[PDB]
């Protein structure tokens, strides 16, 4: 029912982008928490340019994306050079290893990301996570493309 973005990011492991519908994604997209209060998270969002890793420090302010004011399902983002303004966790597995995130950027841009806590096989992921994402991907594939920024050999 309820997907807590603050708890999804409450981890010391890397959270990888396993799939995205962003048009021009960099490789090896991942987030790494630096520190966290109840209402705020500082984390490092990195990607790769062939061989070099590029780190961006992100200031994130949790907020209530839905009408439910008891749950932090949204985060306002500063520091993301894709000009991401906000993110919305619309599903996470019970163990919070898998999550689906709507990403909102610039004025009118939006895409979806399948985010995974730690390196693991795609087949091992929460089935609902996988099938919801795959259903969406199949339904929009005529105009929007899903790709995987993740490689095993990402740093
Ligand atoms: Cl895009």
Residue numbers in the entry: 48 to 59, 59a, 60 to 152, 156 to 172, 174 to 191, 191a, 191b, 192 to 203
Excerpt from the publication:
Functional and structural characterisation reveals that members of the CirpA family directly bind to properdin, inhibiting its ability to promote complement activation, and leading to potent inhibition of the complement response in a species specific manner. Whilst many molecules act to control inappropriate activation, Properdin is the only known positive regulator of the human complement system. All CirpA structures share a lipocalin fold with a short N-terminal α-helix followed by an eight-stranded beta-barrel and a longer C-terminal α-helix.
Overall, the structures appear very similar, with the biggest conformational differences in the tilt angle of the C-terminal helix H2 as well as variations in loops between beta strands 4 and 5 (L4-5) and between strands 7 and 8 (L7-8). We identified three regions with high conformational variability between homologs. All these regions are part of the observed binding interface between CirpA1 and properdin, and hence the conformational differences might render other homologs incompatible with binding human properdin. Another CirpA1 residue undergoing a conformational rearrangement upon properdin binding is Y122 which forms a hydrophobic pocket around properdin P377 together with CirpA1 residues F122, Y131, and F150. This pocket is incomplete in all three CirpA1 homolog structures. However, it is likely that the homologues have evolved to target properdin from other species, especially given the identification of multiple CirpA homologues in a single tick species.
